[PDB]
């Protein structure tokens, strides 16, 4: 099943689209999780919002200017907090001559331009805006309420973690980047591209994630010494040519307006925006995640980074291991190829 761990694309019917959790289980039955990233194109008739012109009374509280330093396919991205702005201000900069999408023919050309120009003309990214663009009425794949076991954090312990159990909006322009990372606690993510230009993604299969970590640690021994999981800083950019040179297996895919991307536990990904767009994002879980959460290597160097108590998950969903786990004896080795238990119905 998917032996090259390539990114798969799915086209559910409206009937299939109703049960979020079941559909994640299904795409894992087909091997999607091996890639680390999958694309889901929703039914033609489904839309999460009637229109998107009413936008600008929405504030971007903390836009970030992305300064990139490096050379030879290896970069560090510094995020500089700017003053709050409207979508309107963002769009104007996005579409200005200095700071709009270059003319290009094929993706491959736009990609070359990205990697050639990523240290020049620092763009602004309207990242991490708390809020949703779904209407209250929309029940299918509603990023504001996906109803997975992740809900145990909010319902059992009361804690809300912005962008993790709540929706974030991202306003992109040309050449805004997301650095190589897995999700907080090695969770799943869902990303819906509401409108605008594409977002391009790179992915490294979870079964090869340790190999990328080794590579990263090799290139930045400074950061390795100061932090157990420096990639969680979301500052490290590494080009596909670099990955290819060091034999890291990876895939690429472009997400267009109206498509969902799913990332899987321990799926390293990175990418960039083609132009003005808006994405909405959140984290979520399945039972398979539990072991990943238990085994996640967290940032040890800056505090108020995202940590979830695994206790409630182990007790409830792995009752046979709860004791072994509490006394630190567990020792389960994760098999990255195994689909989530809920997929049994389809296997
Ligand atoms: Ni991510
Ligand atoms: Zn750290």
Curated annotation (Swiss-Prot):
**Tissue spec:** Ubiquitous.
PTM entry text = Ubiquitinated by RNF8 and RNF168 following DNA damage, leading to its degradation. Degradation promotes accessibility of H4K20me2 mark for DNA repair protein TP53BP1, which is then recruited. Also ubiquitinated by the SCF(FBXO22) complex; leading to proteasomal degradation.
- Mutagenesis or variant effect for residue 181 to A: Abolishes histone demethylase activity without affecting ability to bind H4K20me2
Q: Which positions are annotated as binding Fe cation?
A: 181, 183, 269
Q: Where in the cell is it found?
A: Nucleus
Please report the stretch or stretches of sequence annotated as the JmjN domain: 7-49
Q: Where is the signal peptide?
A: none
Q: Which domain of life is it from?
A: Eukaryota
Residue ranges annotated for the JmjC domain, each copy included: 135-301
UniProt-annotated binding residues for 2-oxoglutarate:
125, 191, 199, 234
UniProt-reported outcome of changing residue 158 to A: Abolishes histone demethylase activity
For the ligand (Zn(2+)), the binding residues are 227, 233, 299, 301
Biological role stated in the UniProt entry: Histone demethylase that specifically demethylates 'Lys-9' and 'Lys-36' residues of histone H3, thereby playing a central role in histone code. Does not demethylate histone H3 'Lys-4', H3 'Lys-27' nor H4 'Lys-20'. Demethylates trimethylated H3 'Lys-9' and H3 'Lys-36' residue, while it has no activity on mono- and dimethylated residues. Demethylation of Lys residue generates formaldehyde and succinate. Participates in transcriptional repression of ASCL2 and E2F-responsive promoters via the recruitment of histone deacetylases and NCOR1, respectively.
Q: Identify its protein family.
A: Belongs to the JHDM3 histone demethylase family.
Record note on domains: The 2 Tudor domains recognize and bind methylated histone H3 'Lys-4' residue (H3K4me). Double Tudor domain has an interdigitated structure and the unusual fold is required for its ability to bind methylated histone tails. Trimethylated H3 'Lys-4' (H3K4me3) is bound in a cage of 3 aromatic residues, 2 of which are from the Tudor domain 2, while the binding specificity is determined by side-chain interactions involving residues from the Tudor domain 1. The Tudor domains are also able to bind trimethylated histone H3 'Lys-9' (H3K9me3), di- and trimethylated H4 'Lys-20' (H4K20me2 and H4K20me3).
What does the annotation say about its assembly with partners? Interacts with histone deacetylase proteins HDAC1, HDAC2 and HDAC3. Interacts with RB and NCOR1. Interacts with VRK1. Interacts with FBXO22; this interaction promotes KDM4A ubiquitination. (Microbial infection) Interacts with HTLV-1 Tax protein.
Q: What is this protein called?
A: Lysine-specific demethylase 4A
Q: Name the source organism.
A: Homo sapiens (Human)
Its organism's taxonomic lineage begins at: Eukaryota, Metazoa, Chordata, Craniata, Vertebrata
Q: From which residue to which, out of the full length, is covered? A: 8 to 354 of 1064
């Amino acid at each position: 099943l998917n032996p090259s761990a390539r990114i798969m694309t799915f086209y559910p019917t409206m009937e299939e689209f109703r049960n979020f959790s079941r559909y994640i289980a299904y795409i894992e039955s087909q091997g999607a999780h091996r890639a680390g990233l999958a694309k889901v194109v929703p039914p033609k008739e489904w839309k999460p919002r009637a229109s998107y012109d009413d936008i600008d009374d929405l504030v971007i509280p903390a836009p970030i200017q992305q300064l990139v330093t490096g050379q030879s396919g290896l970069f560090t991205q510094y995020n500089i907090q700017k003053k709050a702005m409207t979508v309107r201000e963002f769009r104007k900069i996005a579409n200005s001559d200095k700071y709009c999408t270059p003319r290009y023919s094929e993706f491959e050309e736009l990609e070359r331009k990205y990697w050639k120009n990523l240290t020049f003309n620092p763009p602004i990214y309207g990242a991490d805006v708390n809020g949703t663009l779904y209407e209250k009425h929309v029940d299918e794949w509603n990023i504001g309420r996906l109803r997975t076991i992740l809900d145990l954090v909010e319902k059992e312990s009361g804690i809300t973690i912005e962008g993790v159990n709540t929706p974030y909006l991202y306003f992109g322009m040309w050449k805004t980047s997301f650095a190589w990372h897995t999700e907080d606690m090695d969770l799943y993510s869902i990303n819906y591209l509401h409108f605008g230009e594409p977002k391009s993604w790179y992915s490294v299969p979870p079964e090869h994630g340790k190999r990328l970590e080794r590579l990263a640690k090799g290139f930045f021994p400074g950061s390795a010494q100061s932090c157990e999981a420096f990639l969680r800083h979301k500052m490290t950019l590494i080009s596909p040519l670099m990955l290819k040179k060091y034999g890291i297996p990876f895939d690429k895919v472009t997400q267009e307006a109206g498509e969902f991307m799913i990332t899987f536990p321990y799926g390293y990904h990175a990418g960039f925006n083609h132009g003005f767009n808006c994405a909405e994002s959140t984290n979520f879980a399945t039972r398979r995640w539990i072991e990943y959460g238990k085994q996640a290597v967290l940032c040890s160097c800056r505090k108020d980074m995202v940590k979830i108590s695994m206790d409630v998950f182990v007790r409830k969903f792995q009752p046979e291991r709860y004791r072994l786990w509490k006394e630190g004896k567990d020792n389960t080795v994760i098999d990255h190829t195994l689909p989530t238990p809920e997929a049994a119905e389809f296997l």
